[PDB]
Amino acid sequence: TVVSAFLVPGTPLPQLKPEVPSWGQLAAATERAGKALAASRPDVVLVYSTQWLAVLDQQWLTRPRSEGVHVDENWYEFGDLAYDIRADTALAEACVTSSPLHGVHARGVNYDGFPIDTGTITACTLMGIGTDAFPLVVGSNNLYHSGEITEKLAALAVDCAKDQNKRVAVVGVGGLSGSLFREEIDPREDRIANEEDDKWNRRVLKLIEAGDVSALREAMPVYAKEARVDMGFKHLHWILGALKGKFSGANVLGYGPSYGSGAAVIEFRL
Amino acid sequence: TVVSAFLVPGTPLPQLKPEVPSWGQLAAATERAGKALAASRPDVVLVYSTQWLAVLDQQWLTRPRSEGVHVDENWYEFGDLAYDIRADTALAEACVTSSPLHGVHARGVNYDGFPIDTGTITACTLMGIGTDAFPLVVGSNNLYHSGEITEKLAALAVDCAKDQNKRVAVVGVGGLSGSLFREEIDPREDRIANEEDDKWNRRVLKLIEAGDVSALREAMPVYAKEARVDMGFKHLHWILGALKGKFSGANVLGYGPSYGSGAAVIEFRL
Amino acid sequence: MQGEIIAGFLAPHPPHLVYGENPPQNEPRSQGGWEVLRWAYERARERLDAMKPDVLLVHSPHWITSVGHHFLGVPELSGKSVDPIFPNVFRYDFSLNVDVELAEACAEEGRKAGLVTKMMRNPKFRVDYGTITTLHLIRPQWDIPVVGISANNSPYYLNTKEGMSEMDVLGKATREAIRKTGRKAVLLASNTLSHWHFHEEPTIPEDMSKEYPATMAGYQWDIRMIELMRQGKTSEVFKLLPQFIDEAFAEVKSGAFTWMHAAMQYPELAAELFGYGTVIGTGNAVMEWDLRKAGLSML
Amino acid sequence: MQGEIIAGFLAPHPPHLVYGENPPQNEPRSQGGWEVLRWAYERARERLDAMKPDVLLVHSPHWITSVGHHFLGVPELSGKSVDPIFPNVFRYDFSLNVDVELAEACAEEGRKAGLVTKMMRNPKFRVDYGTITTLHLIRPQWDIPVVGISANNSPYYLNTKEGMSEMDVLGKATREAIRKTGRKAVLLASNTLSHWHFHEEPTIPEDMSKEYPATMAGYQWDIRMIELMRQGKTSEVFKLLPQFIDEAFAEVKSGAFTWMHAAMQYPELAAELFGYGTVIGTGNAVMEWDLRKAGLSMLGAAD
Numbered sequence A, B: 001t002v003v004s005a006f007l008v009p010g011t012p013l014p015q016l017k018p019e020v021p022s023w024g025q026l027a028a029a030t031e032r033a034g035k036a037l038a039a040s041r042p043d044v045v046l047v048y049s050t051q052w053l054a055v056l057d058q059q060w061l062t063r064p065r066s067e068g069v070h071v072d073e074n075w076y077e078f079g080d081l082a083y084d085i086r087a088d089t090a091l092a093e094a095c096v097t098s099s100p101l102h103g104v105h106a107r108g109v110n111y112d113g114f115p116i117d118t119g120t121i122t123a124c125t126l127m128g129i130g131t132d133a134f135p136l137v138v139g140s141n142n143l144y145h146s147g148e149i150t151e152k153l154a155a156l157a158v159d160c161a162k163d164q165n166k167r168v169a170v171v172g173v174g175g176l177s178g179s180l181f182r183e184e185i186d187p188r189e190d191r192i193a194n195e196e197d198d199k200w201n202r203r204v205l206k207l208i209e210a211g212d213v214s215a216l217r218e219a220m221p222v223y224a225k226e227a228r229v230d231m232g233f234k235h236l237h238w239i240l241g242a243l244k245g246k247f248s249g250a251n252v253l254g255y256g257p258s259y260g261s262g263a264a265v266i267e268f269r270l
Numbered sequence C: 001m002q003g004e005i006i007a008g009f010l011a012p013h014p015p016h017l018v019y020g021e022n023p024p025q026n027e028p029r030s031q032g033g034w035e036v037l038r039w040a041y042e043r044a045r046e047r048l049d050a051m052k053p054d055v056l057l058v059h060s061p062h063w064i065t066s067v068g069h070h071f072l073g074v075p076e077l078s079g080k081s082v083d084p085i086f087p088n089v090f091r092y093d094f095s096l097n098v099d100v101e102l103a104e105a106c107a108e109e110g111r112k113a114g115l116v117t118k119m120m121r122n123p124k125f126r127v128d129y130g131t132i133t134t135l136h137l138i139r140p141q142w143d144i145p146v147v148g149i150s151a152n153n154s155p156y157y158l159n160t161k162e163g164m165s166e167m168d169v170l171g172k173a174t175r176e177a178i179r180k181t182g183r184k185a186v187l188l189a190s191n192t193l194s195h196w197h198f199h200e201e202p203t204i205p206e207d208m209s210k211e212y213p214a215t216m217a218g219y220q221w222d223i224r225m226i227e228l229m230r231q232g233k234t235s236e237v238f239k240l241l242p243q244f245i246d247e248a249f250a251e252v253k254s255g256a257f258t259w260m261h262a263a264m265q266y267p268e269l270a271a272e273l274f275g276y277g278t279v280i281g282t283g284n285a286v287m288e289w290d291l292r293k294a295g296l297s298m299l
Numbered sequence D: 001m002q003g004e005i006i007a008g009f010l011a012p013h014p015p016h017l018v019y020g021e022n023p024p025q026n027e028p029r030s031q032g033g034w035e036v037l038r039w040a041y042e043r044a045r046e047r048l049d050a051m052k053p054d055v056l057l058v059h060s061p062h063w064i065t066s067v068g069h070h071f072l073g074v075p076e077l078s079g080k081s082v083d084p085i086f087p088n089v090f091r092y093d094f095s096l097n098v099d100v101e102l103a104e105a106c107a108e109e110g111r112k113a114g115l116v117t118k119m120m121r122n123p124k125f126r127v128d129y130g131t132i133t134t135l136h137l138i139r140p141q142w143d144i145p146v147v148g149i150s151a152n153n154s155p156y157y158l159n160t161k162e163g164m165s166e167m168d169v170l171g172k173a174t175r176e177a178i179r180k181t182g183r184k185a186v187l188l189a190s191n192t193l194s195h196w197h198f199h200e201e202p203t204i205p206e207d208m209s210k211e212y213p214a215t216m217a218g219y220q221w222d223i224r225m226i227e228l229m230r231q232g233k234t235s236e237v238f239k240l241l242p243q244f245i246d247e248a249f250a251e252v253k254s255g256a257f258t259w260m261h262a263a264m265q266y267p268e269l270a271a272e273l274f275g276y277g278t279v280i281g282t283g284n285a286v287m288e289w290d291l292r293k294a295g296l297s298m299l300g301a302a303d
């Protein structure tokens, strides 16, 4: 049922200012991830973003068409993010229904002007997803959900897709190390904040390349703590859950900084 | 287990001003019930007073000794009601425990200066109960309890007494018709407020003398509404409950007025 | 001469509010509780402290009389007030002084107005727990004389409208007594609003995590009624009162609220809400009609 | 010309309070609700109405910045503020005016004091739902210029102490900006107290029979802190603030409360409690420090 799997950055900097070389490389890598996505011919894109935050019940985006212009509350100086995002309402609504049967209270969210997060927006734009051809099923990052529960939501959603006879591309949206600079820098001089974060990023990126799920699994919690990884790396858990804890290897299409934080585009070989 | 049974009035007017002929006859009649109670040699007296009001839990008097001087908030002009009430804590505490097993949340009440009602006090004084020889197990009139629930509390108590091998005298304290005058009268001109109440009082008084429980139960709720009977005649339900819904007749030792309302002393024949 | 009715307080009597304060005279000791309502009363206390009145008149639902309307009539009354339903929270040693002259005036004026009245002359009489609670809540110093008025049966034995009419006359009689005696008095209607309630405390009565409106309907009725009197739409409050009583099971059926407003002559005057809160699910509001500020206090 | 901090308000931002009011700006309609807290805000509204300040400064936990402390720097801002967690209760069309001059003064003084500060100059920026809710709650007319301040990450990313220390510096930076400009300003700390909450969405959210403290201990913390404030024991509240943060998950960890008092110079002044209530279990107090009445409002000669 799953035909494709990708991890892409939630940072809007690669989109907003690609003329900063390393940012531009990350944007180019995301674009390429989108082309690979398209070539796998999915009917839906199963999306989780670390920046789409829920605290009460799990939210699933159920608005057929959401359009607007978003200004990131940290990176507003670098420009605006126009969006026209399509949802697979039939599938998202089935995930809402299926969630409590797997022990997670859930609702749909279908409101004009609902604040879709920066990550979902930039992924859609760079990857060319969230269109009428590649509509989204977006599940929220509930701050009280562990990685294990995030995996449960992902698998749960893949099953619903199998019931509706839809091929699924899975996309996890979030960063790597999260040591963002706490002063203004020259964007051209952007780099990973510290060496320890860089080593940790490179170490786990190689585990993913090799398809070493066993070693990756035990590294993840220590990595998340020590490198301040975006939201406990639950966006990878989302990929793992959809893939049922199995993938042969990966191709890191890009790895680079985003205002001190780490970011990567990863194409997964199922 | 149960060895005698009585219904006596809750009004203090017989005790406080017996020089009024009609009130003196009721006072004398209550004392005569006291003697009949003494002759049955009970170990405890199982009491329910119409004026002992509960709202939340069922209350059971668990204070070993309560003494003080009560001034009735309607009839304070006619004098004071001194008391020294002894309780059977063992039996009362057993009733507190058994109550929720029969579906009624209950609590003990053991506090210095707890407001014991006028009915219980005047019944103790006139009948000579509440002593060390004839200690009380008093159960409250909970306003949300029906007659059937009142019987369930009485039978529950009688079962507790059976387990403790105690001889029980039952006492229901309360009035008959309740059409109290709403202006001040000459006590020497006191009488039942109207014929209808008198007719009703006499009609059901006869049903009790006969021992016709089936007919009595038919009349009671209609009687209660039409003759404004003290607290739905639940102090009778208490007696019927304690006697397991059966008895063979009664002697009406006294019947007369108490400021328009009806009052009576009934000796039951088991 | 110059008799004055300075203000009227809606001053309910939940014993829990005194339990939460841990005053010297209340035996049981709490860990706090109901501070929103207690803070509401703190405001009420300041306002009363500034008024400097001769006397506090109180009408309590928990001194119930069948034969007319009764008034405290002995100079000094004291005792140990134990709440029969909540004895674990309220066991209060009290000592108060009665303004016997004014109490006698009220009774005589009620008598002349066609009501049956009586003076309570028994010195061993135990003043009811509701009167004691309300009085502690607005004046814990116990340094202002009082007139304790009973709540006659009529609303329950007869019906609401006939009962309220007797309270209306009692209110008018009360106004005349204050006018004739030249007293500067505040009125205290000791009534809660909606009286639908929980069927037990949660072992720890102070656990405010378990304190909330008993019903949505009751709360909505309470909010509606107190908003209305906050708008000074008194006429509208009293037209809704019988329905409010029936549906919210409100303690104002007892008559204190009608008695107070009748004595004030139903002032179309915006009342101040010091606070609303819940105790065992019942709706309780603490409010004032400042007739002195409105220029309506002089009789 | 003298600059003045007329007063500081603990003005929390639970959106249910605007939902229950049913103003024209808010799309969804309620059958009322939370009127205790709402009546508390009517008291707050009329006190502010009498102040007639030049500017309202607000510090919101729901504009979260990593790179220092940010200030709204566009003259006119507007939009449709939809709450991400309670979209069924808050979809609010707004249009507000920013006191850019003071906002720039604040940013300036903050930088000079060792903070990193930024001006927000993107005119399509959507002002955060917390800021819009507090402003509506205290001033529904939308007739006073505002200065929106972001809540820098520091209390969470570093630790409570180090973040609080930044908020303190921000506060005295703000005071200095107010006094140099000669503005007559009111401060708005947009923080709730205990933030333990219900995890479940209650069908009909206005049902006040199902609104109550989430925990006993959290409520107990709120009362204790509220008492000290109205007692005037300000040094005792701030000594307890970290333990209060941890045990009660209090939203003052965001920094608004410390920023405010730092700007007011931690006055040992009795605060007025307009009201306390819960919303989804969280403790919210609407309060005021009237510096004008205390005679502590005036800051010094402006430039």
Ligand SMILES: N=C(C/C=C\C=O)C(=O)O
Pocket: D013, D014, D015, D016, D130, D192, D251, D279, D280, D282
């Ligand atoms: N601080 C709060 C508290 C309460 C409810 C809704 O917001 C918030 O979530 O914004």
Ligand SMILES: N=c1ccccoc1=O
Pocket: C013, C014, C015, C191, C192, C251, C279, C280, C282
């Ligand atoms: N009126 C009352 C309401 C609530 C609980 C206790 O005291 C009362 O009697």
Ligand SMILES: [Cl-]
Pocket: A010, A011, A012, A051, A072, A074, A118, A119
């Ligand atoms: Cl971002």
Ligand SMILES: [Fe+2]
Pocket: C013, C061, C062, C130, C192, C251
């Ligand atoms: Fe009451």
Ligand SMILES: [Fe+2]
Pocket: D013, D061, D062, D130, D192, D251
């Ligand atoms: Fe918040």
Ligand SMILES: [O-]
Pocket: C061, C251
């Ligand atoms: O009551």
